[PDB]
Design an enzyme around this catalytic site. Structure first.
Site, PDB file in Angstrom:
ATOM      1  N   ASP A 181      57.481  37.792  27.090  1.00 13.59           N
ATOM      2  CA  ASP A 181      56.640  38.286  28.178  1.00 13.59           C
ATOM      3  C   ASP A 181      56.822  37.428  29.426  1.00 13.59           C
ATOM      4  OD1 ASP A 181      54.971  40.041  29.436  1.00 13.59           O
ATOM      5  OD2 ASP A 181      53.112  39.280  28.557  1.00 13.59           O
ATOM      6  N   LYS A 237      39.530  29.172  27.908  1.00 12.36           N
ATOM      7  CA  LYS A 237      39.582  30.599  27.607  1.00 12.36           C
ATOM      8  C   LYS A 237      38.697  30.870  26.396  1.00 12.36           C
ATOM      9  CE  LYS A 237      43.497  32.674  26.238  1.00 12.36           C
ATOM     10  NZ  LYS A 237      44.851  33.242  26.490  1.00 12.36           N
ATOM     11  N   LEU A 285      36.779  31.857  36.241  1.00 17.17           N
ATOM     12  CA  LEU A 285      37.980  32.223  36.977  1.00 17.17           C
ATOM     13  C   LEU A 285      38.371  33.678  36.778  1.00 17.17           C
ATOM     14  CD1 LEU A 285      40.074  29.033  36.238  1.00 17.17           C
ATOM     15  CD2 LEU A 285      38.972  29.632  38.406  1.00 17.17           C
ATOM     16  N   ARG A 307      53.741  36.963  36.899  1.00 18.07           N
ATOM     17  CA  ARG A 307      52.330  36.822  36.562  1.00 18.07           C
ATOM     18  C   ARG A 307      52.102  35.785  35.473  1.00 18.07           C
ATOM     19  NH1 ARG A 307      54.205  41.449  33.997  1.00 18.07           N
ATOM     20  NH2 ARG A 307      54.122  41.226  31.715  1.00 18.07           N
ATOM     21  N   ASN A 308      53.115  35.504  34.651  1.00 18.31           N
ATOM     22  CA  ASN A 308      52.992  34.559  33.549  1.00 18.31           C
ATOM     23  C   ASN A 308      53.611  33.205  33.878  1.00 18.31           C
ATOM     24  OD1 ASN A 308      51.546  36.324  31.940  1.00 18.31           O
ATOM     25  ND2 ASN A 308      53.363  37.132  30.894  1.00 18.31           N
ATOM     26  N   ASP A 320      51.211  31.980  29.024  1.00 21.51           N
ATOM     27  CA  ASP A 320      50.962  33.177  28.227  1.00 21.51           C
ATOM     28  C   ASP A 320      51.955  33.316  27.080  1.00 21.51           C
ATOM     29  OD1 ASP A 320      50.298  35.633  27.154  1.00 21.51           O
ATOM     30  OD2 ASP A 320      49.966  36.593  29.089  1.00 21.51           O
ATOM     31  N   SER A 360      37.921  37.430  33.948  1.00 23.19           N
ATOM     32  CA  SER A 360      37.454  38.066  32.726  1.00 23.19           C
ATOM     33  C   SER A 360      38.130  39.419  32.583  1.00 23.19           C
ATOM     34  CB  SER A 360      35.928  38.223  32.697  1.00 23.19           C
ATOM     35  OG  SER A 360      35.433  38.777  33.903  1.00 23.19           O
ATOM     36  N   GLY A 361      38.200  39.875  31.344  1.00 23.51           N
ATOM     37  CA  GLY A 361      38.849  41.133  31.014  1.00 23.51           C
ATOM     38  C   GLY A 361      39.246  41.160  29.548  1.00 23.51           C
ATOM     39  N   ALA A 362      40.373  41.827  29.292  1.00 27.89           N
ATOM     40  CA  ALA A 362      40.835  42.035  27.922  1.00 27.89           C
ATOM     41  C   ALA A 362      41.012  40.715  27.183  1.00 27.89           C
ATOM     42  CB  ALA A 362      42.146  42.827  27.937  1.00 27.89           C
ATOM     43  N   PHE A 363      41.633  39.735  27.838  1.00 31.00           N
ATOM     44  CA  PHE A 363      41.861  38.433  27.225  1.00 31.00           C
ATOM     45  C   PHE A 363      40.567  37.727  26.854  1.00 31.00           C
ATOM     46  CE2 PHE A 363      42.164  38.502  31.822  1.00 31.00           C
ATOM     47  CZ  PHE A 363      41.195  37.599  32.207  1.00 31.00           C
ATOM     48  N   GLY A 364      39.448  38.104  27.473  1.00 28.59           N
ATOM     49  CA  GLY A 364      38.203  37.375  27.332  1.00 28.59           C
ATOM     50  C   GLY A 364      37.732  36.863  28.683  1.00 28.59           C
TER      51      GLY A 364
HETATM   52  C1  LIG Z   1      43.403  35.616  38.308  1.00 24.56           C
HETATM   53  C2  LIG Z   1      44.673  35.001  38.897  1.00 24.56           C
HETATM   54  C3  LIG Z   1      44.602  33.474  38.797  1.00 24.56           C
HETATM   55  O1  LIG Z   1      45.547  32.856  38.307  1.00 24.56           O
HETATM   56  N1  LIG Z   1      43.467  32.929  39.297  1.00 24.56           N
HETATM   57  C4  LIG Z   1      43.252  31.601  39.288  1.00 24.56           C
HETATM   58  C5  LIG Z   1      43.602  30.771  38.219  1.00 24.56           C
HETATM   59  C6  LIG Z   1      43.330  29.403  38.273  1.00 24.56           C
HETATM   60  N2  LIG Z   1      43.615  28.470  37.346  1.00 24.56           N
HETATM   61  C7  LIG Z   1      44.070  28.709  36.107  1.00 24.56           C
HETATM   62  N3  LIG Z   1      44.635  27.674  35.466  1.00 24.56           N
HETATM   63  C8  LIG Z   1      45.128  27.824  34.167  1.00 24.56           C
HETATM   64  C9  LIG Z   1      45.014  29.060  33.546  1.00 24.56           C
HETATM   65  C10 LIG Z   1      44.415  30.108  34.237  1.00 24.56           C
HETATM   66  C11 LIG Z   1      44.300  31.302  33.640  1.00 24.56           C
HETATM   67  C12 LIG Z   1      44.875  31.592  32.478  1.00 24.56           C
HETATM   68  N4  LIG Z   1      44.548  32.848  32.189  1.00 24.56           N
HETATM   69  C13 LIG Z   1      44.955  33.620  30.992  1.00 24.56           C
HETATM   70  C14 LIG Z   1      43.776  33.325  33.162  1.00 24.56           C
HETATM   71  C15 LIG Z   1      43.209  34.524  33.308  1.00 24.56           C
HETATM   72  C16 LIG Z   1      42.429  34.808  34.421  1.00 24.56           C
HETATM   73  C17 LIG Z   1      42.256  33.816  35.373  1.00 24.56           C
HETATM   74  C18 LIG Z   1      42.872  32.589  35.165  1.00 24.56           C
HETATM   75  C19 LIG Z   1      43.613  32.363  34.077  1.00 24.56           C
HETATM   76  N5  LIG Z   1      43.962  29.896  35.484  1.00 24.56           N
HETATM   77  C20 LIG Z   1      42.706  28.877  39.395  1.00 24.56           C
HETATM   78  O2  LIG Z   1      42.481  27.530  39.364  1.00 24.56           O
HETATM   79  C21 LIG Z   1      41.477  27.121  40.298  1.00 24.56           C
HETATM   80  C22 LIG Z   1      42.341  29.685  40.465  1.00 24.56           C
HETATM   81  C23 LIG Z   1      42.611  31.047  40.407  1.00 24.56           C
HETATM   82  N6  LIG Z   1      42.271  31.848  41.425  1.00 24.56           N
HETATM   83  C24 LIG Z   1      40.871  32.294  41.488  1.00 24.56           C
HETATM   84  C25 LIG Z   1      43.227  32.241  42.476  1.00 24.56           C
HETATM   85  C26 LIG Z   1      43.553  33.725  42.291  1.00 24.56           C
HETATM   86  N7  LIG Z   1      44.338  34.286  43.397  1.00 24.56           N
HETATM   87  C27 LIG Z   1      45.089  35.447  42.895  1.00 24.56           C
HETATM   88  C28 LIG Z   1      43.407  34.744  44.436  1.00 24.56           C
END
Ligand SMILES: CCC(=O)Nc1cc(Nc2nccc(-c3cn(C)c4ccccc34)n2)c(OC)cc1N(C)CCN(C)C
Ligand SMILES: [Ca+2]
Length: 316
Positions: free
Chosen positions: A143, A51, A24, A147-148, A161, A26-30
């Site tokens: 925070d 993660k 889904l 975004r969070n 977050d 990648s970057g600073a967080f991993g």
């Molecule tokens: C990057 C933005 C985003 O949220 N992307 C996203 C996340 C989830 N799911 C989900 N669930 C729980 C935790 C996280 C999550 C926690 N951290 C710390 C993250 C860091 C990076 C990415 C995801 C996470 N993500 C998803 O689920 C299918 C689909 C998408 N997309 C591809 C849609 C994006 N859109 C803007 C086009």
């Protein structure tokens, strides 16, 4: 009163039990993958976010993610992110509930033409509920931002977050930070100036988050760089009234941005006010074609065999 034993359970998951399917982000967080967690022999498949971090080599990567795991294991509320467990492979992975629609900031930016006042006011209610729960737990988020906030469905969002979250002792009434990068434009003035963080500074950040939602994801103080923000706020300047907001809603935001932290609203009061407004949404937010807008929902579809699957319904 004083300090109760934190009897939260931290569950260790074998890597056998979950299948990664796609990356889904990648970057600073991993690196965060989406996947399926199948506890062995229980006939369930649970959509999850996994993660990892970049390297098993950095001990403070492991320390930071373990602190996040402590916090997330200590919270249990429908509007706060749900921690399922940790896997202690070479890379230590954090396994949480998959939130299929992503973060709320990008969701509002992507769907602004379909977001009615009902959804906006309900999101504000739910965020206030999550933050009030965290205050009950004596937890300062530090925070809070659009975004969070993650979107389980358009009707259901959760605060996420906890990388900067701090749990206060019962006699503690504020957290004092000692450097480190912090999001200035969401920060209360006293946090910017004296590194003081409270539930009321979280209220300030809540106000900025609501401003984000009501402008459909605009950047706060778009032109200004962070160093000017302090004196801008000291002059009395604040974020402007969004076009769709009546004075009723904007006044709530403005109250969240008061200099006296004790004159800001408390989260329980924001729950009350925003639910009152949610009972007649077009009276408090004026959005064109509000009446005709509708948003999606799951209809049982992904890339797999999924008769055995669900999410928040897996207790213990
Ligand atoms: C990057 C933005 C985003 O949220 N992307 C996203 C996340 C989830 N799911 C989900 N669930 C729980 C935790 C996280 C999550 C926690 N951290 C710390 C993250 C860091 C990076 C990415 C995801 C996470 N993500 C998803 O689920 C299918 C689909 C998408 N997309 C591809 C849609 C994006 N859109 C803007 C086009
Ligand atoms: Ca289970």
């Amino acid at each position: 009163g004083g300090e109760a034993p934190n009897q939260a359970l931290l569950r260790i998951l074998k890597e056998t039990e979950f299948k990664k399917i796609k990356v889904l982000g990648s970057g600073a967080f991993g690196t965060v993958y989406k996947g399926l967690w199948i506890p062995e022999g229980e006939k369930v498949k649970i959509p999850v976010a996994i993660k990892e971090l970049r390297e098993a080599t950095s001990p403070k990567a492991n320390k930071e993610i373990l602190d996040e795991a402590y916090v997330m294991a200590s919270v249990d509320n429908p509007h706060v992110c749900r921690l399922l467990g940790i896997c202690l492979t070479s890379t230590v992975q954090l396994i949480t509930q998959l939130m299929p629609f992503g973060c709320l900031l990008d969701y509002v930016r992507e769907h602004k033409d379909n977001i009615g006042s009902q959804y906006l006011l309900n999101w504000c209610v739910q965020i206030a509920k999550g933050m009030n729960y965290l205050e009950d737990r004596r937890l300062v988020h530090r925070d809070l931002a659009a975004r969070n906030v993650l979107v389980k469905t358009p009707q259901h969002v959760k605060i996420t977050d906890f990388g900067l979250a701090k749990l206060l002792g019962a006699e503690e009434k504020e957290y004092h930070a000692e450097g480190g990068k912090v999001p200035i434009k969401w920060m209360a003035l006293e946090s910017i100036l004296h590194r003081i963080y409270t539930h009321q500074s979280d209220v300030w950040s809540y106000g900025v988050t609501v401003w984000e939602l009501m402008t459909f994801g605009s950047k706060p103080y778009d032109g200004i760089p962070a160093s000017e923000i302090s004196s801008i706020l000291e002059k009395g300047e604040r974020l402007p009234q969004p076009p769709i907001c009546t004075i009723d809603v904007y006044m709530i935001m403005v109250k969240c941005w008061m200099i006296d932290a004790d004159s800001r609203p408390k989260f329980r009061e924001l729950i009350i006010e925003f639910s009152k407004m949610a009972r007649d949404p077009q009276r408090y937010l004026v959005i064109q074609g509000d009446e005709r807008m509708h948003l999606p929902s799951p209809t049982d579809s992904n890339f797999y065999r999924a008769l055995m699957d669900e999410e928040d319904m897996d207790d213990v």
